[PDB]
Structure formats: structure tokens, C-alpha cells
RNA sequence: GCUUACGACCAUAUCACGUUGAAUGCACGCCAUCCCGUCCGAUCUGGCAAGUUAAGCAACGUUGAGUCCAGUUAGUACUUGGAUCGGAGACGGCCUGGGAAUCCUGGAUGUUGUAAGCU
RNA sequence: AGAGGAACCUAUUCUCAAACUUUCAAUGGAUAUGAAGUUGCAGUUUCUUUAGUGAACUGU
RNA sequence: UCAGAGAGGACGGAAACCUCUCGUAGAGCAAAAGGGCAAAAGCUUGCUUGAUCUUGACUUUCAGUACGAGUACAGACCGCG
């Protein structure tokens, strides 16, 4: 059986990428970070402490806590036939702000942006519902300096 | 065509006052072997020669085979610059006799030599203490190296400015009249 | 000899941070000290940069954010003269001076010198801007970049320049001018005429008795200037009053019209024609060689 | 003695090779990999003739010496030892591993069975697929038929099959021969040895001028 | 007679046979874990609202 | 583009294809059931229909028909309001079931034979 | 078109050699009474302005090395799912969908923020 | 394994790595996709800020 | 600023000690292996006892028990700057 550190196994996962050594971008501690908001983990090396665990390295979490220069994640774990939301204390140097989140962010205020606009500018409601790309229309094309090449399958060459 | 005019420029830069070659420092070097007295007389030479209190180098190892041990000090070092420097190294230059050959210069524009007593550098003998070699270093350089050395948005000096062989050859032998012996046989 | 500096060499190597490859700032101290808490959020955590050149004091205001620092205030003590002094532009009384400056001249701007006048006499002793009414003082924290912090240094002068000013500048007097660091005992006395420059004083009355020529040509555009060792503590303390008096920043000038004074580069085309020429000029010098 | 390759045939484990986990690894039965003129310049011999693997198996050391010792062999008494380079282009360099047992009465009071089975260094094989090189003979245009039957004799030794066919590259080189004739007269290919060099365009013209291209 | 024999062979199944049951909702309400001197504020804070 | 996907997860158990205009008619009037409140109710009557896609001005099986042929805006719910056909083995049989369409087999898109393999289903 | 202070991204910014550098500035620079630190005013520190763009630095140059981007490699290698598929087997192709990376070829050689100033 | 300047330097070359890697799939993992939301107005705080400056909370 | 290389210097040699250039870490960091680190996490040096007092929360193993180890805070008294 496997030996049950906290660390094994983490080779490349806790490895910095190539010519990415050294010196950690001061970017990361100006990130504003609130409670509420979602986090990406992922490990950083170069910081032993506040590290998360293997387990949680790649995964997406809440934050619920914000200290001093760390943030406090409920990170959906899955043991057995239940998914548990544990709670980890991790360091700004090992997160990073998720997009997903804030894309629907910005469709949200978009779609509440032109229902106002289309109301009060007398207009029908607009569709504010993604869908699914639909099967391509009819449509013609032009042969004009575009004729078709009649192609054939090709015989066996001996390649040596 | 272009290159008299190209060749003309060159010649007025390297012109410079700013490119003057200068003696840097003055390194004296005795490497006693051994701790103990033997190392606190040389220490006095060297003060009495330079007139600052000289350093203490300790071996970086143990060799057996030159009876030394790690971390015992075994040669004593000062550094002179300023014109306390040019003395001494007058005094050197004339216990050599203005004599030097073309493989004591480094190609990066310095040189040294050995004297092998140092009362021939007119140090009245004293017989509590006796009588000691010293190595002697000479760098050379321009002014504008400080940018090289300054803590703060250190460079690299640029090829122009550094120093060569033959233009220490060219300073030793303008300045001190010096001779070059030639090559000794190999 | 293996050449060390291969392709393999520059293949593998990975460049520092270009502020550390100009070797202009720390990142180890720079963490430390732009960094805010996470549970203040946004909120703005002042710094005061100083630096001093070889002709010139700046001293500076800023906080940081995530495309760069944010300027707020800045003194120069190339402004000086716009205050009396003419010469002397780097020592300690130019930086105290300059820290003065810029201590008054950003609480003018927040709508904050009535309140905080700062410690308007100049006696030397420590001083710390004491809350008045509701709103605490200003606060910045001291900047000093690659410099040595020794006893005595212009950077702790322009610190305590904004001190007295009247913007609170977590500090203690251990590093001031007059400090022993043997006894740790203050002189304020000594300290005060260090900022009022009696040192420059002392050493031009030196200098003047030891040999004149030694001491035109180290105060020569002193003389021309007209200040001898016997009226620059009287202007050192008229600058600091005229500071008091007037702090905004200087009017600026209209943008005058700029042309080209460097090459600009050459087009690919350019290029090309230039490999060309070459081309051709070579192989006409290897036929007639 | 040796156990029959038929053991040690197919390609089962992952690579083994010897290091610093795999000691006390003996040596290759094969040690020479280049036999023949193989100092002759790169124009001198033209033709290349190749035996490609149709197996995806173990090629034994003493397998790969054998078939070089036939061919080497046919090829000097056939064509003198100038006038062929044979390149055996297959290394040995993966550990099969022996689990021995006593195969005397009453071993089984000290046989171990199948408990604590890892084997210890038995041989170096050379793991091959299908379209792999495993030897490579360049000679002149009129010993074609030489090379041919040469290396018909040398499939023998090995297990499974082999398909012998000529290439249409020059010799050792990665250029087919017209291409060949016509960068080498262009000057883009500079002789290397037994192989070339392709001068790519880009450098110092300083340096072009020492062979306009 | 070797009885170590561990497996993971019919783990899912039994796993997904009542469903994998994600968290709930209001997990995200409680104030548990939270910095006390937040906590200690946020009290004050409610304490004193008027109500009208 | 949100379906397609399933299409393909599913490939080796279905056969599917594009239905057409009597395929349309024959699965509605031979073997049309509704979903009635979890019950599965033949569809011998336009009223049926009215009574459950009334609201949505659909009232009869033409209704219907129109709305799947021509992907209506409530397709979803017309759709949904029929129970799963439930089809006849074909009268000729199968040919493999194992391979797909084009490897002589049964099983993906048959595109628009799926038509001539309904007219022996339905 | 630039200079400086503080930066953000951290080589399209690095490295080598060379040309040019208006004005501000930066820099080198002179001195060592004082503060301060050294075997050594070399570094660090302090007081200055005779001199210099020589070096640093900036722009530019190079069929430049590196780095970055793209093309090709190639619908190739590999791979999800299917077959009472071929083959003694190793393996191989077909159906259904994903789909690379070297060599090689071409191009680019920092972008930008706040504050102050020159032009 | 030769080549260009016995070893050495330079540019190459044949064959490789479960405990080698610049690069890097397919399958795979995770999160989000609104009423428990979005905009304001109008109050609380002993936390935070030089500061209604923020953070959070409260309101029939 | 390391490992190392190059070039120089009385006795000094392949190796003692001094000097200059280059040097992406090829060194070192108590120990196994793997990560990490260059105005440092290495080397030299000053001062020190946060290796202290108190409770909760959480991670790891996990049954989401306990020990051990660790993480982020809060309250006190301190160290360095």
C-alpha cells in the first residue's frame, strides 16, 4: 500500500512551470477577493504554507472567509454516494478569481440592461434565452471561378 | 571613402579624458602557510609597509601535504589605493628594476609580481620580527567602473571601455619605463 | 575551453522581473510593503517613495493597484528654488525641505492643512502627529528602495520632513540625525542644525581658514549665488516659511511641438534591400580579392 | 544454459533499462554496431539497402551478433572489406529478468515457490516493431544484388519476419537521391562524414560569404 | 489461505443506487468559521438598526 | 447542437432517421397516445388534444402533425405530450442490429430511410 | 519625439557586436570637515559641480543566437464508442466521433499605467 | 559513428528511459448558468479607512 | 552570492592564499527521495526567545472517531526591524 503523506504523489502537480521559477507577481495579493465570490485552486510551490490539499488542486470554491492573507473556500468533495462541502483555509498565492462566474455576471446585467431599454423604449420584450445552434439554412453556392476537383483515391507508393 | 571619416571619430572618442587608465588598488598578499606568530609578524610588516591594519584569510580547507587545516589563518592581505599605492608600487617596480615579462599581465588588463624580501623595499629590519615575501597586484582600469560595482542598477561596462593586455603593457611601459624581458623559456 | 553561454544555455534560461534586471526594486521589501490585507479590501495603503539622485530629492506618494502604482503628490527639490534656495540641492536640509513640501502640498490637496498645521516650530524632538478632531492624520509608510538605512541618511530626513509637515509616518528616532547608537540618546539640538544645514556652515568657515582655493572650487557656485557660511541657516528657515506659506504645485506650460531626433526603424522591405546590397557588395569585393 | 528465446519473445513488460534500480546487469553479447568502410565519404556509396521488422517482438543480443557476423562475413568475402558500411541500427538495451528454480530431485525442500518472484538480470533485447530498421547496408549501385542476398542470409537468425527493400534516400543521408544531386550542386548540403549538412539561409552574410548559397 | 484482497469493484454501483446527494443550500448562510473580530462587528452592528 | 450530442452517445442502441410527411401522419392517427395525467390515453379524437395543447392553439392531430413536421415553438410540449411510441417489429425483419447503417447494419442514421423502415414498423 | 521616480504584464523585453544621442534628466564625476561604514571613502555614507558622453542608459543596425506568433508536419501519430470484423498469434484495417508534437518554412523583436519635466 | 579545428573544442550522427523532459491529446474531473436575483433609498457598526472610505448587515 | 571555468600573482606545485572577468543555480539548505528557493529559503553577521499563555474553527487518516501532524484566524505578553 501507498504511504499517506500530504504530499505524495504531487511531483508536477506543486511544480512550477517552466521558466516560471522564482519571483511571485505582486497581481496576485492586489486580486480583490470577497466572501461570496468563486475561487480556482491551484497549488503554488513556491509557498509551503497555507497550501491545499492534492484533493482540492484544480478544483472551484466559495469563499466564506477573508483574513488577513487568506480566504476560507467550501470546496465540494465527493466521499462515497455523498458530496461533501468541507471547508479549507487557503492563501492568496494558491487561488485565483474563477470566470465563469462572472461571465453569467455580465450576461445578467445584459439581459436586465436591454429589458429596460426595450420597456422603456416601447419596443416588444426582447429574447434574452441562449439556445442551442440550430441546423444550418438553405442557402446557394456559386460555382464562378470556383469549379469543382474531381478527386480519386490515391494508389499504394512503396515509401522506403 | 566613409571608413576615413569612421576611422577619424574612433580615434577622437578613444581621445576621452574620461578613458584615462588609473591604478584601481593595490593588493600585498603574504601567505605566511601557518598560524601563530609567524602570521602576527607579517601581519606587523604589512602595517608598517601600508600603514593600515592588514586582514587575515583563513584556509578553505585541509590539506595534509601543506600542513593546513580548516578555518586556521594562514595569510594576511591589505588593500591600498590612492597615491600610497603608486609609492609602493614604485618601491616594488624598483626592487624588480622596472623588469617585467609579457606573462605577468591578465587579460583583463591587470598584473603582479613578487618580491621575495621585504627589507629590499627599504623597511629598516627588525630582528623580533624577520623577514618576509609579499605578492603584489596591480588593477587597472578607467574610470566608469563604479557602474559595475554600485548596488543600485549595476551594468556592464562596455568592451571600448575595458582594458586589454597590450594596453597594460602600454601604461607599465610609459609610465614606470619599463622593460619587458622576453618570454621565459617554456 | 566548453562554451557556457550555448543555445542550450539561452534555451533554458529564464529572465528576472525587469525592474530586478535594472536592478531598481526590491520585490522581497516591495511585498511587504504595497500589500494590503484582504479583509481591507480596495482600500488605498499609502507609501511614501524616497529616492535621491545625484542632483535632486524626490519624494513621493502612492499606493499601489493592479496595472501600477498611483501617484498622488510629489516634491522635487528642483522646486526649491521657487522657495529662495538656489544651490544645495541634495543635503540634508534640501531633503528635509523637500519632505516638508510634500507633506504640506498633498494636505492642502485633501482639504487637510487647516486641520493638521504639523509641528510649525522647529525644535529637532520626535515628533508624531497627534489626532485632532474626528479625522486621524494622513498615513504613509516610508519608501526608501535600495538605499543603506544608516544613522544619520537624507532618506530619514525627508521622513521626518513629512512628519513635521503633518502626515503620520510610523517611525522612531533611531535612525535620525543625532542619534548615538552606543548610548541611545537623542540630541535634538544636533538634529535641528543638521536640518538647518549648520554643517554645510561649519564646513565652508573651514575650508575658507584651511586654503581658498580648496574652498572655491568646493562651494563655488555657492559664492555665485551669494550664500556664505554666516546667512544659510537664515535661508534654510525662510525656505521652510515660504513652504508653510504657498504648497500647490507649479502651473504647467503648453505642449510645444515635438519632432523626430532618434532613427526610426527600418521597414521590412528596407531590410531586405539592405541584405540585397550586402549580398552583392560582398560578392563584388571576393571576386576582386 | 540460455532459455529459449520463445520465453522472452513478445513484448510484455514495460522498458527495463539498466541504472541505477537495475544492478549487476550483464554485458551485451553485441558491441560493434558499424562494420565494413565506414570512413568512406558520403558520395561514395549511393545505394542503401534496409531489412525492416514485420514483428513487434524481443531481438536478442546474441541474435542481433549473430546475423551481423553472417552478413558481415558474406559481405567481405563477396565484396571486399571497402567495399560496403553495414549499420546495425537496433541498440539492446532492455533487461529481461530470470525467476531461477532448482530443477533437481527434491528441490521442492528449498524452493520458494511463487513468493518474493522477482526475477534478477538474465540478457539485453532489443524491443523492434512493425516498420522498424534493423540493419542498414550502403554500397555501390552495382552491389545491390550483394547487400540483398546479404542480409536474405542474416534474416535467418532472427525470430518471426523480415521484408528487405532498398530506399530511395542517398545512402545514410534523409535526402532522396535527385534531391540530393541537386541541393549538393546547389551547395546547400555540406559533407559530414559519413552523412551532410543542410546550410539553412539564415545567419551572418560574413559567414554566407564563405559559400554563397 | 491470503485474505488481504482489497477492491473497489462494486463501489459505484452501490454508491449511485440512492443517488449522490449534493449539498444542500443553506450551507452557504451560516456564519460558522468566520473571523471573530467580523463577527464580534457584525453583532454590534445589528444590536443597534432601529426597527422604524 | 444540444441534442446531437445524445445522438451520438446512443448510436449503437437506436436507429433514427428524418421522418416525412406520411411517416408524420401514420405514427399520430395508427398509434398516437397521450400522456393524461400519467395515464396513457389513445388518441381516437381532436378533443383529446384540444384538452391539453388547446392553450397553445393546438386542436387537432393536423395541429399536431404541423407543429413536430415543422418545429413549431412548442415543439417541446407537444412533443412531450405524446406517450413513447410504441412500434411493431417490422414485417421483413431486421438486417444486423449490430453494425451501423452504413456497415450494412441497422443501428445510427439512416437519414430519410428511416421512413421506409416506419412504413414496415408502424 | 524623449528624460526621470514608482510600477503592471515578466525575453516580441534576453544576449553578442556596432552607430548615434538635440533638451531636460539620469549617469559617470570632484572632495572626505561633519554623520556613517570599511584592511581599503572600492562598496556604503556625507559636502559639492571642475570635467565627460568614454562607459552606464535610450533609439537604431545585423539574410545575428535566443524568445514569441503563424504555416507545414496532417486529418498524419494517438484516441472514445461498434462489429458472430481479417489474422495461428503479434497485430491490422473498417464504422462512429475527437485530434496532436518535432524537423522544416515565414514573420515580430516589448506593450502600457500614475506623477514630474524636456522638446 | 565519423567530420571540421590522442585527448580537447565546434557542428552533426545511430539507438533509448517505470522511478527523463521543452511540448502534449482522446477519454476524464470540477464549478457556474437568476426571485434565496438585479437595480436603486435609507438606516446600523465598538470592524476598516485620512475620509461614506470600505465590508457587512437591517427595512412589513 | 553559490558550484564551476578562464586569466594573472615570491617560496606556491594539480592542489594553501590574493586579484580580475564569466558564471539560471549546474551549489547549499541536519538527514532518504521528490518539490521549493538568488538583494533568498543559501553564506556572513547584530539582537533575541513566537520552541511562551488561552479557546474555538478547519485540513490530513477518516467511520468524516481519536491520537499525531498541519492550516487560517481571535485574545494576551513579547522578539527583530
Request: charged share 30%.
Amino acid at each position: 500500500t501507498n504511504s499517506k503523506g500530504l504530499r505524495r504523489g504531487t511531483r508536477y502537480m506543486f511544480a512550477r512551470d517552466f521558466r516560471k521559477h522564482g519571483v511571485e507577481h505582486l497581481s496576485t495579493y492586489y486580486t480583490q477577493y470577497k466572501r461570496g465570490d468563486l475561487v480556482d485552486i491551484k497549488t503554488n510551490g513556491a509557498f509551503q504554507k497555507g497550501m491545499p490539499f492534492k484533493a482540492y488542486h484544480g478544483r472551484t470554491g466559495r469563499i466564506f472567509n477573508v483574513t488577513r492573507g487568506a480566504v476560507g473556500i467550501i470546496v465540494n468533495k465527493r466521499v462515497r454516494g455523498n458530496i461533501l462541502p468541507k471547508r479549507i483555509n487557503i492563501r492568496i498565492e494558491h487561488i485565483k478569481p474563477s470566470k465563469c462566474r462572472t461571465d453569467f455576471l455580465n450576461r445578467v446585467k445584459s439581459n436586465d440592461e436591454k429589458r429596460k431599454a426595450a420597456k422603456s423604449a416601447g419596443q416588444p420584450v426582447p429574447a434574452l434565452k441562449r439556445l442551442p445552434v440550430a441546423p444550418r439554412g438553405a442557402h446557394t453556392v456559386t460555382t464562378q471561378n470556383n469549379e469543382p476537383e474531381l478527386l480519386a483515391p490515391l494508389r499504394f507508393e512503396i515509401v522506403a | 571613402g566613409d571608413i576615413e571619416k569612421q576611422t577619424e571619430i574612433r580615434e577622437k572618442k578613444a581621445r576621452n579624458v574620461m578613458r584615462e587608465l588609473k591604478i584601481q588598488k593595490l593588493c600585498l598578499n603574504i601567505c605566511v602557510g601557518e598560524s601563530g606568530d609567524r602570521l602576527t609578524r607579517a601581519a606587523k610588516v604589512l602595517e608598517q609597509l601600508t600603514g593600515q591594519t592588514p586582514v587575515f584569510s583563513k584556509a578553505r580547507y585541509t590539506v595534509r601535504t601543506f600542513g593546513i587545516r580548516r578555518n586556521e589563518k594562514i595569510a594576511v592581505h591589505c588593500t591600498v589605493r590612492g597615491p600610497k599605492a603608486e609609492e609602493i608600487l614604485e618601491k616594488g617596480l624598483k626592487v624588480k628594476e622596472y623588469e617585467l615579462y609579457k606573462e605577468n599581465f591578465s587579460d583583463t588588463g591587470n598584473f603582479g609580481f613578487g618580491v621575495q624580501e621585504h627589507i629590499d623595499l627599504g623597511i629598516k629590519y627588525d630582528p623580533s620580527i624577520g623577514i618576509y615575501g609579499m605578492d603584489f597586484y596591480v588593477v587597472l582600469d578607467r574610470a566608469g567602473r563604479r557602474i559595475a560595482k554600485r548596488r543600485r542598477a549595476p551594468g556592464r561596462v562596455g568592451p571600448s571601455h575595458r582594458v586589454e593586455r597590450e594596453e597594460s603593457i602600454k601604461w607599465f611601459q610609459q609610465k614606470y619605463d619599463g622593460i619587458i624581458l622576453p618570454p621565459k623559456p617554456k | 575551453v566548453k562554451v557556457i553561454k550555448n543555445k542550450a544555455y539561452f534555451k533554458r534560461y529564464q529572465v528576472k522581473l525587469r525592474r530586478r534586471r535594472e536592478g531598481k526594486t526590491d520585490y522581497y521589501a516591495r511585498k511587504r510593503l504595497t500589500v494590503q490585507d484582504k479583509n481591507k479590501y480596495n482600500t488605498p495603503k499609502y507609501r511614501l517613495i524616497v529616492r535621491i539622485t545625484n542632483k535632486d530629492v524626490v519624494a513621493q506618494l502612492a499606493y499601489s493597484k493592479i496595472e501600477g502604482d498611483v501617484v498622488v503628490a510629489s516634491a522635487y527639490s528642483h522646486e526649491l528654488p521657487r522657495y529662495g534656495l538656489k544651490v544645495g540641492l541634495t543635503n540634508y536640509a534640501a531633503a528635509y525641505a523637500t519632505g516638508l513640501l510634500l507633506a504640506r502640498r498633498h494636505l492642502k490637496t485633501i482639504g487637510l492643512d487647516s486641520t493638521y498645521k504639523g509641528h510649525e516650530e522647529l525644535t529637532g524632538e520626535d515628533y508624531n502627529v497627534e489626532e485632532e478632531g474626528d479625522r486621524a492624520p494622513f498615513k504613509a509608510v516610508l519608501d526608501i528602495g535600495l538605499a543603506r538605512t544608516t544613522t544619520g541618511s537624507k532618506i530619514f530626513a525627508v521622513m521626518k520632513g513629512v512628519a513635521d509637515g503633518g502626515i503620520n509616518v510610523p517611525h522612531s528616532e533611531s535612525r535620525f540625525f543625532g542619534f548615538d547608537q552606543e548610548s541611545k540618546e537623542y540630541n535634538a539640538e544636533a538634529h535641528r542644525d543638521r536640518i538647518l544645514g549648520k554643517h554645510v556652515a561649519d564646513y565652508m568657515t573651514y575650508l575658507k581658514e584651511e586654503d581658498e582655493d580648496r574652498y572655491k572650487r568646493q562651494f563655488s557656485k555657492f559664492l555665485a549665488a551669494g550664500l556664505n557660511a554666516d546667512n544659510l541657516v537664515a535661508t534654510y528657515q525662510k525656505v521652510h516659511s515660504a513652504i508653510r506659506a504657498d504648497a500647490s504645485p507649479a502651473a504647467k506650460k503648453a505642449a510645444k511641438p515635438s519632432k523626430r531626433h532618434t532613427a526610426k526603424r527600418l521597414t521590412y522591405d528596407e531590410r531586405k534591400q539592405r541584405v540585397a546590397d550586402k549580398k552583392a557588395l560582398l560578392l563584388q569585393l571576393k571576386e576582386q580579392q | 544454459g540460455r532459455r529459449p528465446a520463445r520465453c522472452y519473445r513478445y513484448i510484455k513488460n514495460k522498458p527495463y533499462p539498466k541504472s541505477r534500480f537495475c544492478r549487476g546487469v550483464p554485458d551485451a553479447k553485441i558491441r560493434i554496431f558499424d562494420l565494413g568502410n565506414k570512413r568512406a565519404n558520403v558520395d561514395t556509396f549511393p545505394a542503401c539497402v534496409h531489412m525492416m521488422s514485420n514483428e513487434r517482438e524481443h531481438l536478442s543480443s546474441e541474435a542481433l551478433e549473430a546475423a551481423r557476423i553472417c552478413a558481415n562475413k558474406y559481405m567481405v568475402k563477396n565484396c571486399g572489406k571497402d567495399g560496403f558500411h553495414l549499420r546495425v541500427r537496433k541498440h539492446p538495451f532492455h533487461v529481461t529478468r530470470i525467476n531461477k528454480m532448482l530443477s533437481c530431485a527434491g528441490a521442492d525442500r528449498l524452493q520458494t515457490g511463487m513468493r518474493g518472484a522477482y526475477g534478477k538480470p538474465q540478457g539485453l533485447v532489443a524491443r523492434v516493431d512493425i516498420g522498424d530498421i534493423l540493419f542498414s547496408m550502403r554500397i555501390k549501385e552495382g552491389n545491390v544484388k550483394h547487400a540483398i542476398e546479404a542480409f536474405r542470409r542474416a534474416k535467418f537468425k532472427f525470430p518471426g519476419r523480415q521484408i528487405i527493400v532498398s530506399s530511395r534516400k542517398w545512402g545514410f543521408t534523409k535526402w532522396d537521391r535527385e534531391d540530393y544531386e541537386r541541393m549538393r550542386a546547389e551547395g546547400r548540403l555540406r559533407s559530414d562524414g559519413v552523412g551532410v549538412q543542410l546550410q539553412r539561409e539564415h545567419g551572418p552574410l560574413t559567414k554566407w560569404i564563405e559559400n554563397p548559397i | 489461505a491470503k485474505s488481504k484482497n482489497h477492491t473497489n469493484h462494486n463501489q459505484n454501483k452501490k454508491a449511485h443506487r440512492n443517488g449522490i446527494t449534493k449539498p444542500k443550500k443553506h450551507i452557504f448562510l451560516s456564519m460558522k468559521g468566520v473571523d471573530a473580530k467580523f463577527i464580534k462587528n457584525l453583532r454590534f452592528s445589528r444590536k443597534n438598526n432601529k426597527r422604524q | 447542437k444540444a441534442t446531437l450530442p445524445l445522438l451520438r452517445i446512443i448510436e449503437p442502441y437506436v436507429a433514427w432517421g428524418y421522418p416525412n410527411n406520411k411517416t408524420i401522419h401514420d405514427l399520430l392517427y395508427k398509434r398516437g397516445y397521450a400522456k393524461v395525467d400519467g395515464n396513457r390515453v389513445p388518441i381516437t379524437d381532436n378533443t383529446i388534444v384540444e384538452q391539453s395543447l388547446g392553450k397553445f392553439n393546438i386542436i387537432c392531430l393536423e395541429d399536431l402533425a404541423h407543429e413536430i413536421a415543422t418545429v413549431g415553438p412548442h415543439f417541446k410540449e407537444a412533443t412531450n405530450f405524446l406517450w413513447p411510441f410504441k412500434l411493431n417489429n417490422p414485417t421483413g425483419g431486421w438486417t444486423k442490429k449490430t453494425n451501423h447503417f452504413v456497415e450494412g447494419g441497422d443501428f445510427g442514421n439512416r437519414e430519410d430511410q428511416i421512413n421506409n423502415l416506419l412504413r414496415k414498423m408502424v
